[PDB]
C-alpha cells in the first residue's frame with residue numbers, strides 16, 4: 001500500500017530569505033546564500049500552521065504572498081495593507097490551513113488541500129511584476145489526510161517565456177526510474193497563457209491529479225491550458241504502460257516549444273539506460 | 278440550515294430595454310432610464326419560463342442573446358434568424374429552463390442550472406462586438422432545487438481591458454460583513470484571456486463553486502483562466518478563516534493588474550471597521 | 555436503451571499515409587489520394603492495440619504522434635527518438651490502450667478513454683509547427699466499456715485562425731435531425747487561445763461531456779476556453795428543448811468570430827426544413 005499523508009495540526013516554524021542573485025535575478029531560500037528559482041517547496045498537512053520568519057536581504061522592499069492558504073490581512077504581503085518588508089527587515093508571516101468539514105448551516109466547508117504557490121507582491125510594481133519576473137516564486141503543497149505521497153516532487157514554472165527562469169533550450173530535465181511515483185507541481189506566471197503537455201503520460205484534471213476509483217468523471221488529459229498564477233499538480237507512475245525513454249514535456253503553443261520552452265522527463269531502466277537517448 | 282432554492286416551474290414576465298447612455302455606452306435595464314452596465318441580474322429556478330418584452334430604444338438594431346438557457350431559434354437574437362430588433366421596436370424573447378432527468382434511453386439529461394449570461398448579438402457586427410464593448414451584457418443565474426442561496430450576489434465582468442466597463446483603478450469595490458455568504462458571478466467578454474484571482478478566499482471549480490461534501494474531487498482554487506463569453510460563479514463565506522480586511526480581487530495577468538484591473542472585497546467587522554484599511 | 559461501447563482488447567491493423575495536397579496543404583488518410591484535413595477519425599475501445607503501417611509519401615520527413623494513448627518511445631514520432639519517417643518511407647507505429655483498474659498499492663490506474671488527437675511532429679520544426687499548420691492533425695476517440703455511442707461524430711479543429719484549415723466564412727457546416735445524438739470532437743492547434751461556443755446546446759465539462767446521473771457536480775457549459783493541443787469532446791441531442799434551426803457554433807473571441815471562424819449546426823425537421831433558414 002502506498003504511503004499516505006497523516007492527519008495535520010502541527011505548528012511549524014520556518015525561516016525564509018529573499019536575496020538578489022549574482023546574475024540579477026531574485027530568489028527565495030530557507031538559508032542565506034541558498035536562494036533558488038523556483039523557491040523551495042513548502043509542504044504541510046491540512047490543519048498545520050506555518051510561521052515564516054521572513055528576512056528581506058535586498059535593497060528594495062519585498063514581500064511573501066501565498067495563494068490558497070488561510071492568512072490574516074496582516075500576512076497578505078501587500079503594500080496596501082502594510083504587509084511588505086523594508087530592505088534588510090524581518091517579518092513573521094503566518095499561514096494557516098484547515099480541514100474540510102460540516103458547517104453548522106449544513107453546508108460543506110472546503111479544506112485547504114491542493115497545489116498552491118507563493119510569490120512576491122511589491123517588487124517593481126504593487127503586484128510584484130518585477131519580483132515575479134526576477135524569480136520570487138515557489139510552490140506550496142497542502143496534503144489532505146490520506147492523500148497519496150510521491151517518491152519525488154518536481155516544480156515546473158512557465159514564467160513568461162521561460163521555464164523556471166532558465167534560458168530557452170536548457171530544460172530543466174528531470175530523472176526517474178520506471179515505476180517511480182513522480183509528482184509535478186505546475187505553476188504559471190507573468191503575461192502569457194500556456195499549454196502544458198507531457199509525452200507518454202497523463203493525469204486527471206481534478207484536485208490531486210489522480211482518480212480515487214471508478215466513480216470520478218474527471219477528464220484524463222495530457223495537455224492543459226494555464227494562465228498567470230494558475231497552479232495545479234498531479235502524480236504519474238514514470239513509464240507506466242510506455243517504458244523507459246526521454247519523454248518530452250513542453251508548452252504546446254507552437255512558437256513557445258519552437259523557441260525552446262521544452263524539457264525532458266528522463267525515465268531510466270534500473271541500469272540507468274534510456275532507449276534512444 | 279441555509280436557505281435553498283425551491284422547485285421551479287413558474288411562468289415569469291419581464292420588461293427589458295436597451296438604451297444609449299449619456300457617456301456613449303449602451304446598457305440593458307428593467308426600466309427606461311435605469312439601464313446599467315452590467316445589465317440587471319436575471320435569476321430563475323430550473324423549470325421556470327421567462328417571457329422578456331424587450332424594447333430597443335436605440336437608433337441602431339440591437340438584440341438579446343442568452344447562453345445556456347433553452348430558446349427556440351426565433352429567440353436567438355441574431356440577424357441571421359431575423360431575431361434582432363429594429364430601432365424603437367419591441368420583441369418578446371422567450372427563455373425556458375428544464376430540470377435534469379432520465380431520458381427514455383436511460384441517459385441523463387442535464388438541467389439548465391448554472392451561471393450564465395446574456396448579451397447583444399448585432400450591434401457593430403453580426404456577433405455584437407460593438408454592443409458587448411459598449412456594455413450590452415448581464416448575468417443570468419438558474420438555480421437547481423436545493424441550491425444554497427447567498428446573502429448577496431455581485432457580478433464581475435472582465436470586458437476587454439475593463440472591469441464592468443469602468444475606467445482602470447476605479448474598482449468596482451464590494452462590501453460584506455465577516456460571515457456573509459457572498460455570491461460572485463464572473464463573466465468574461467471581448468478579445469483577451471484573463472485570470473480571475475481573489476485574495477484570502479477560495480472556491481470549488483465545479484457547477485456551483487461549492488462542494489456538497491467529502492466525495493467531490495473538484496479542484497479548490499483561488500485563480501482561474503477565462504476567455505471571451507466564459508461564465509462561472511461561486512459562493513464564499515466572507516472572511517472565513519481569514520478575518521476582516523480589504524481583500525483584493527484582480528486579474529492576475531501582470532500587465533492587467535498593473536494597469537488597474539483590480540478591485541476590493543471589503544470585509545468588515547460588525548462595527549464597519551476594516552483592519553489596515 | 556442507447557447503444558454502448560463493449561469491452562475492448564482487440565488487436566487492430568491500419569494503414570495511414572501522409573500526402574502533399576494539390577493546394578499546398580498536407581493531410582493524413584487511410585488511402586493514398588484520400589487524405590483529408592482533419593485526418594480521418596481513429597476510434598478504438600479501451601484495451602485495443604493499434605498497429606499503424608504509416609507511409610510518408612511526401613518529399614520531406616514526417617511523423618505520427620499521438621496524445622493520450624500508450625506508446626513506447628520508438629513510436630513517439632519525434633526526430634529526437636529516431637521515430638519520424640524519411641520521404642517515401644514506411645514505419646509501423648504501435649498505439650496501445652488500457653482499461654482502468656486497481657494497482658497493487660491500492661491506487662487507481664486511470665484508463666486511456668477520452669477524446670484525443672494525433673499530429674505530425676517534424677514538418678517545418680522539430681515540434682511539427684509546419685506540419686500542423688498545413689493540416690497534419692486528426693482525432694482519436696478511446697471508448698470505455700459502457701460509454702454511450704452517438705449517431706454521428708463531427709470533428710471541429712481551431713487551427714490558428716481557421717476551422718479545419720478552411721478559409722474564414724466557409725464553415726464547415728454540419729447537419730442533423732431533431733433528436734439525433736451528435737458527438738463533437740473539439741481540438742485546438744497552433745499559436746492562439748480560443749473559446750468554443752454552440753448556440754442552443756450545452757454539455758458537461760468532464761471526460762465524456764455528458765453526465766451519468768444526479769451525483770456529478772461538473773459544470774454544464776456552452777462556452778469553453780482552449781489552447782494549442784487541447785482536446786475535449788461531448789454529445790448533445792440535436793435540438794433538445796430548442797427545436798430545429800440553424801444553430802451557430804463559433805469561436806467567441808470577438809475578432810475571431812468577426813473574421814469568420816463560425817459555422818452552422820443545421821438541425822432539421824424530418825422534412826428537412828429549418829425554421830428561419
Ligand SMILES: [Cu+2]
Pocket residue numbers: 121127476525527
Ligand atoms: Cu494579488
Ligand SMILES: [Cu+2]
Pocket residue numbers: 158193194195251252253256257261
Ligand atoms: Cu508557453
Ligand SMILES: [Cu+2]
Pocket residue numbers: 197198199200619620621
Ligand atoms: Cu504529445
Ligand SMILES: [Cu+2]
Pocket residue numbers: 067119229474529
Ligand atoms: Cu498571486
Ligand SMILES: [Cu+2]
Pocket residue numbers: 398404753802804
Ligand atoms: Cu453567437
Ligand SMILES: [Cu+2]
Pocket residue numbers: 435470471472528529530533534538
Ligand atoms: Cu485580465
Ligand SMILES: [Cu+2]
Pocket residue numbers: 065066067474475476477
Ligand atoms: Cu493572492
Ligand SMILES: [Cu+2]
Pocket residue numbers: 344396506751806
Ligand atoms: Cu455569447
Ligand SMILES: [Cu+2]
Pocket residue numbers: 199248250675681
Ligand atoms: Cu511534443
Ligand SMILES: [Cu+2]
Pocket residue numbers: 712747748749805806807810811815
Ligand atoms: Cu478563436
Ligand SMILES: [Cu+2]
Pocket residue numbers: 342343344751752753754
Ligand atoms: Cu450564444
Ligand SMILES: [Cu+2]
Pocket residue numbers: 197252621673783
Ligand atoms: Cu501534441
